[PDB]
């Protein structure tokens, strides 16, 4: 079960941001991998293992956090698209693909 | 949700229906100056089931039954957006319209490519349908008796007002009439307050003597 | 697959849950396997694993190797392909000559008319008279060799006269590069249909692997050489890129308009058909 | 096709702040509802709107905005869990639902 | 479905892609059908569509309507709930007075020996031993009355002498509340049956729709009376949601310890498996 | 109440001083509680609400619901105050076998009699000489199955020999889609009556849920093999337009030209109150 | 010319219904006005108009409808009179 995480929660006070650093050291120390900012994703084994995931989640949210949990399908992992304003290629139809010079 | 000033000894609940009396004219009169300057003064006092201040805008206060209009520029604001919330909610219906919409805009940009002046035009979105066609609440009202119902509905309608409170407006309502408006209160869950100068026989009301002391009555 | 993939830059490659996953320190990029037609390393510094090469050969997958110069140097040619090919070897054993030089001898003068199709269209006229007359002139066993006089008033008359086929020039170099990838499409396709790439049919002394994928890709060079053609005053590079295009741009088939790949295959699936029927149909391609 | 969009860019600037309710007035103007900060979400009827969408999404794009675009299905959109620092109901297995008074 | 859905607010519900939509202007929130058990609307103000009712006669979903005083009302009974209730039908008008008297004769004595098993529970040697008395002494037809006699020692010795079931305290109302949930599972299990629910197994002068899923219903009284005696001082509302709780606990079966909806579910599969067969097996229920 | 209350459009229904308000797209109206006595709902887009169903079950009216198909599913079930209906189906349940054997006879005799006389309406003398044959040889417990044998004569005679019930044929599925249409109007005028349709005129075949509305739609069987005998050669889609046309299409009832409707409520209200008063008039419909 | 129409039609049926909508709707996008049910009167200019107007009324009757079309002057058009509403036992009261 491909679990797709996302992070927010008020980072004005220092006290905030301590805690949002420690809950993102939190989620890296679990196998969380970030994608961007509050974007994360984990790779659960099983549902026993996602539901243990989202007890943990509840116990180490943050003051003010609000966490929003995803199930997805590695077909739908892969059609993810990224758009930076530039967007991910997956979603991108092109027939040609450089990884490399785009010369 | 309870209502409280400082000439109750306690502060009295209002769940569903509710007819309040107040046998002293100084007392009613300086009462509803407190409704209409809920604001401004802090002497009377409402508390709800979390025992937490409401914002005069979450209470509804409405005197003239007639005079009151039920097409508001928030109700169709929230109307309108309810509609098309509606009509998001189903994407096949609402491509159908974007279809129409498209054709309708193809034939009057023919009809634009034909005229001999330059013509510029945006879009048609489906808020301005909504617009055009003037989608309104129900406007026709026979008698006061309908028009308390319409204003019923609107209020049941509206999340944000807690609170429905009317002032001397039973005194147009039959005894009938009044025990219609009850059993459509209850059946509507909504929380109605009513006061008035003189006690109604017959329907169970809270009686505020002169004294100052509540009692209840039937 | 209809994605040509191009790596030219350091990274790790390996093969996980049917998807080819790209490692590097920067970025890491996911592409589906069944979306990948073509997978190109145009740098030694590239990462693979034996499985990912074994996932790549069951989804029958085009790897090109290149060297540092980033030319081509090594492809991966799998060795069953489908079942079909040891029933197509005997077939291709009981071949006969006639069939070979009619079908060869066809397929030159499909390459002859676009050359002269191509220099009609690029309005380059006399030229396109000798390529004409030659390809009314082609006949058996070439002993005019009008293909070759084809080709040298071709080129002769595109480059100039002081150009020439032997020269060391980046024309000659892209145009052995361009006929580098498709003959690496070509061949690929043949290894598809599974009949012996090694076996040519226009002359049974010359003994090369691309001899066969060579004599399917004869008609479709004139495509590479307007390209060259148009693109021979910019540097190597760009002209490189632009031989990249040609897998995005489309063509016409007589049938309907397809992409390039898709009328190779199409293309190499008629010439195998109708070499085993004994040419019911040639199939013609026009630009 | 169930569209999940994310939504992050820097707020700092003026500018950035207009340039981030322009985008979240085209967001609800185009049918997307706002589940909470920077949550999104739209039906798609085909793939082809969703192109068309993914297109227009790209167009609209504000400078230095980052959009996150995933396909989600509607056993996946129900399985939703959004947990503020208070849970959804629908990730929770209770027997007994109350939509009411808690008592 | 394993899960008890109550509304007790102003809300729409509409039905689409086989999920329940609850649309208000605070939230909306989607449950799936396949999940949901029972639906109960609480309140007056609720809306519904008549496609949503179709799409829950199909699910099978027992779909409960209550009045503004919140008491229940009316609930939803469809007409077939699968094809063998027709054949059941022959099979319900071919019963046996002395299967049905029989069966009925142990039923009422699973209720009073689990009503000698919560006096027991609540440590009461004389009262639990009278009625384990009345349970030895209770014979066909019932004319000793020993099941009234029990029941009328029963509330008289848990609530007090002064106490009645004619009384109109929120202890009687919080009874008759329990009695109308827990007779509207069994009723809804008696239609999922097909046997008509109309047709009693104990008297067959009384005329009651309920008759039948009361009958069924009995052994199981003992478990509200014993939440009613500990919440009897706590509010009725109060005493509601722990009636409401009795939804999410568990209780023992003799088989296993499972919910009390796949109790009732099974108790009444064995109960008609057992009218039909002539008292095979009569299941019984143990506190 | 007398008035029979039924919404075959898309509407909404809302209670306002003891004034049912039902409201469709064309028009508003507004109805007494008290003149109303059944209220069904033909379609699925109806909406209704929850205070109008307390208010209908304070009122003891009958809501009944159904599905797309318009078969009913499901009907609402006060816990007190019960509708007289539910006490009629104990008669139903009462009904002798002689009064169902005669009932059961007079129909048959009435589809054959409207077979044959179609049969002289579409000029075949021997045919429906030999169905009226039939029909005058018809006798209770149907030892000779003229029934049966006047089938293939009428089905015969309409669409040829070669033709056949079990074959698979648009014919064949537009004459269940005509059963299916007339099974749904009988069915749900059986449902108005409360009368259980799992309990069947004929007492051979219980497998029907539907067999008592199948048993009483017989009669009236013949009109749809009209129309299908009429359009045989179109398409299924135009047998079903020309089939949905028969709800707007008048026909003769014996005492005056009436729609199908309310043909089909007289009839089914007659042979309800005689199979209840045991045979007081049958009534006989002729085509 | 002056254009008196009456319009009737069977309105049982759903699609009947339906059809008489429509068919007013028409009307009205005509020019014509509904003086009461049934009533309706439109301004024609001339005779073309008007046998124009016939054959388009003829082309937009519904199924089973049936219109009546009299032709009255302009004076004597505003001459329509519009009245909207012996026994010896009279009863004000209950009517028993």
């Given at each position: 079960?491909?679990?797709?995480?996302?992070?927010?929660?008020?980072?004005?006070?220092?006290?905030?941001?301590?805690?949002?650093?420690?809950?993102?050291?939190?989620?890296?120390?679990?196998?969380?991998?970030?994608?961007?900012?509050?974007?994360?994703?984990?790779?659960?084994?099983?549902?026993?293992?996602?539901?243990?995931?989202?007890?943990?989640?509840?116990?180490?949210?943050?003051?003010?956090?609000?966490?929003?949990?995803?199930?997805?399908?590695?077909?739908?992992?892969?059609?993810?698209?990224?758009?930076?304003?530039?967007?991910?290629?997956?979603?991108?139809?092109?027939?040609?693909?450089?990884?490399?010079?785009?010369? | 949700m309870k209502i409280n000033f400082s000439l109750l000894?306690?502060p009295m609940?209002v769940?569903?229906?509710?007819?309040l009396?107040i046998?002293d004219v100084s007392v009613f009169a300086q009462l509803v100056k407190e409704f209409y300057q809920y604001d401004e003064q802090s002497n009377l006092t409402i508390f709800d089931?979390?025992?937490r201040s409401i914002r005069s805008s979450e209470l509804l206060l409405i005197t003239?039954?007639?005079?009151?209009?039920?097409?508001?520029?928030?109700?169709?604001?929230?109307?309108?957006?309810?509609?098309?919330?509606?009509?998001?909610?189903?994407?096949?219906?609402?491509?159908?319209?974007?279809?129409?919409?498209?054709?309708?805009?193809?034939?009057?940009?023919?009809?634009?490519?034909?005229?001999?002046?330059?013509?510029?035009?945006?879009?048609?979105?489906?808020?301005?349908?909504?617009?055009?066609?003037?989608?309104?609440?129900?406007?026709?009202?026979?008698?006061?008796?309908?028009?308390?119902?319409?204003?019923?509905?609107?209020?049941?309608?509206?999340?944000?007002?807690r609170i429905?409170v009317?002032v001397?407006?039973?005194?147009?309502?039959?005894?009938?009439?009044?025990?219609?408006?009850?059993?459509?209160?209850?059946?509507?869950?909504?929380?109605?307050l009513?006061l008035?100068?003189?006690?109604?026989?017959?329907?169970?009301?809270?009686?505020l003597?002169?004294?100052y002391?509540?009692?209840?009555?039937? | 697959?209809?994605?040509?993939?191009?790596?030219?830059?350091?990274?790790?490659?390996?093969?996980?849950?049917?998807?080819?996953?790209?490692?590097?320190?920067?970025?890491?990029?996911?592409?589906?396997?069944?979306?990948?037609?073509?997978?190109?390393?145009?740098?030694?510094?590239?990462?693979?694993?034996?499985?990912?090469?074994?996932?790549?050969?069951?989804?029958?997958?085009?790897?090109?190797?290149?060297?540092?110069?980033?030319?081509?140097?090594?492809?991966?040619?799998?060795?069953?392909?489908?079942?079909?090919?040891?029933?197509?070897?005997?077939?291709?054993?009981?071949?006969?000559?006639?069939?070979?030089?009619?079908?060869?001898?066809?397929?030159?003068?499909?390459?002859?008319?676009?050359?002269?199709?191509?220099?009609?269209?690029?309005?380059?006229?006399?030229?396109?008279?000798?390529?004409?007359?030659?390809?009314?002139?082609?006949?058996?066993?070439?002993?005019?060799?009008?293909?070759?006089?084809?080709?040298?008033?071709?080129?002769?008359?595109?480059?100039?006269?002081?150009?020439?086929?032997?020269?060391?020039?980046?024309?000659?170099?892209?145009?052995?590069?361009?006929?580098?990838?498709?003959?690496?499409?070509?061949?690929?396709?043949?290894?598809?249909?599974?009949?012996?790439?090694?076996?040519?049919?226009?002359?049974?002394?010359?003994?090369?692997?691309?001899?066969?994928?060579?004599?399917?890709?004869?008609?479709?060079?004139?495509?590479?050489?307007?390209?060259?053609?148009?693109?021979?005053?910019?540097?190597?590079?760009?002209?490189?890129?632009?031989?990249?295009?040609?897998?995005?741009?489309?063509?016409?088939?007589?049938?309907?308009?397809?992409?390039?790949?898709?009328?190779?295959?199409?293309?190499?699936?008629?010439?195998?058909?109708?070499?085993?029927?004994?040419?019911?149909?040639?199939?013609?391609?026009?630009?």
């Amino acid at each position: 079960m491909r679990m797709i995480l996302m992070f927010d929660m008020p980072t004005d006070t220092a006290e905030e941001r301590k805690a949002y650093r420690k809950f993102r050291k939190f989620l890296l120390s679990e196998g969380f991998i970030m994608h961007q900012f509050s974007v994360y994703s984990k790779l659960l084994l099983n549902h026993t293992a996602n539901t243990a995931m989202v007890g943990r989640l509840k116990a180490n949210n943050p003051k003010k956090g609000n966490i929003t949990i995803l199930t997805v399908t590695e077909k739908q992992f892969a059609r993810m698209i990224y758009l930076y304003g530039n967007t991910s290629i997956a979603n991108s139809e092109e027939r040609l693909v450089f990884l490399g010079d785009n010369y | 949700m309870k209502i409280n000033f400082s000439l109750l000894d306690e502060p009295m609940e209002v769940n569903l229906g509710t007819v309040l009396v107040i046998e002293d004219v100084s007392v009613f009169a300086q009462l509803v100056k407190e409704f209409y300057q809920y604001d401004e003064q802090s002497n009377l006092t409402i508390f709800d089931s979390k025992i937490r201040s409401i914002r005069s805008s979450e209470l509804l206060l409405i005197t003239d039954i007639l005079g009151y209009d039920i097409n508001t520029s928030q109700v169709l604001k929230l109307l309108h957006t309810d509609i098309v919330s509606q009509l998001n909610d189903k994407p096949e219906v609402r491509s159908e319209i974007d279809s129409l919409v498209s054709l309708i805009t193809d034939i009057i940009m023919a009809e634009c490519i034909e005229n001999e002046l330059d013509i510029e035009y945006d879009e048609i979105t489906l808020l301005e349908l909504i617009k055009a066609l003037g989608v309104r609440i129900e406007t026709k009202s026979c008698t006061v008796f309908e028009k308390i119902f319409e204003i019923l509905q609107i209020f049941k309608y509206l999340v944000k007002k807690r609170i429905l409170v009317f002032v001397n407006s039973l005194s147009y309502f039959s005894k009938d009439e009044i025990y219609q408006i009850l059993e459509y209160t209850k059946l509507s869950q909504a929380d109605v307050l009513f006061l008035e100068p003189r006690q109604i026989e017959g329907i169970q009301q809270f009686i505020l003597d002169k004294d100052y002391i509540l009692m209840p009555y039937n | 697959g209809w994605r040509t993939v191009v790596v030219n830059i350091h990274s790790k490659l390996s093969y996980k849950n049917n998807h080819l996953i790209f490692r590097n320190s920067y970025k890491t990029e996911m592409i589906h396997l069944s979306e990948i037609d073509i997978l190109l390393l145009e740098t030694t510094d590239i990462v693979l694993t034996t499985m990912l090469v074994k996932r790549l050969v069951d989804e029958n997958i085009l790897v090109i190797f290149c060297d540092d110069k980033r030319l081509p140097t090594a492809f991966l040619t799998p060795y069953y392909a489908r079942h079909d090919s040891s029933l197509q070897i005997a077939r291709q054993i009981a071949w006969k000559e006639n069939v070979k030089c009619e079908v060869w001898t066809a397929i030159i003068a499909q390459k002859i008319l676009n050359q002269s199709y191509y220099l009609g269209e690029c309005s380059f006229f006399e030229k396109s008279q000798s390529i004409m007359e030659l390809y009314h002139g082609l006949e058996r066993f070439d002993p005019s060799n009008r293909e070759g006089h084809s080709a040298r008033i071709y080129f002769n008359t595109l480059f100039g006269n002081d150009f020439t086929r032997e020269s060391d020039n980046d024309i000659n170099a892209a145009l052995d590069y361009g006929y580098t990838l498709l003959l690496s499409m070509f061949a690929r396709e043949v290894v598809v249909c599974g009949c012996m790439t090694q076996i040519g049919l226009k002359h049974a002394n010359q003994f090369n692997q691309f001899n066969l994928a060579s004599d399917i890709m004869e008609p479709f060079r004139p495509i590479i050489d307007r390209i060259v053609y148009q693109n021979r005053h910019n540097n190597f590079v760009k002209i490189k890129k632009e031989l990249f295009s040609i897998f995005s741009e489309t063509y016409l088939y007589n049938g309907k308009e397809m992409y390039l790949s898709n009328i190779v295959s199409d293309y190499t699936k008629k010439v195998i058909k109708a070499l085993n029927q004994l040419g019911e149909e040639i199939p013609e391609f026009r630009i």
